[PDB]
Amino acid sequence: EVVHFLEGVCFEKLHIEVLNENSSHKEIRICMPKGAVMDKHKAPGAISVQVLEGKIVFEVGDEKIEMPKGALISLEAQVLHRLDALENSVIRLSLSK
């Protein structure tokens, strides 16, 4: 019932894992090595992306919003986005139902 987003972080490869799940959300952790990129990603439901550690650039549509530690962004279902890690980053993705 208690997950640890900063415990077991590895910056060797791009890691995506489901740490926890309710029928309301899905809690996913993303470890991005510096330089890692996640292009074209499209989520089925609404999502909220927050940088727990590090720094990334979030790109949606035309804008490139740089997200430092603590930045949170919400997207609507079926919206095309991209993630570029400016630093070793740990991201928390909350996928909704």
Q: Within its chain, how far is the Cα of 27 from the centroid? A: 10
- Residue 62 as a binder of its own copies (CB under 8 A): the answer is no
Shortest approach of its own copies to residue 90 CB, angstroms?
8
Amino acid at 38: M
- Written as six digits, the tokens of 70 are 């603590």
Closest listed residue to residue 89, CA positions, set 42, 56, 64, 61: 56
> Mask of contacts with its own copies, 4-43, x by CB under 8 A?
xxxx-----------xx-x-xx-x----------------
Site for its own copies, residues 63 to 92, rule: CB under 8 A: 65, 67-76, 90, 92
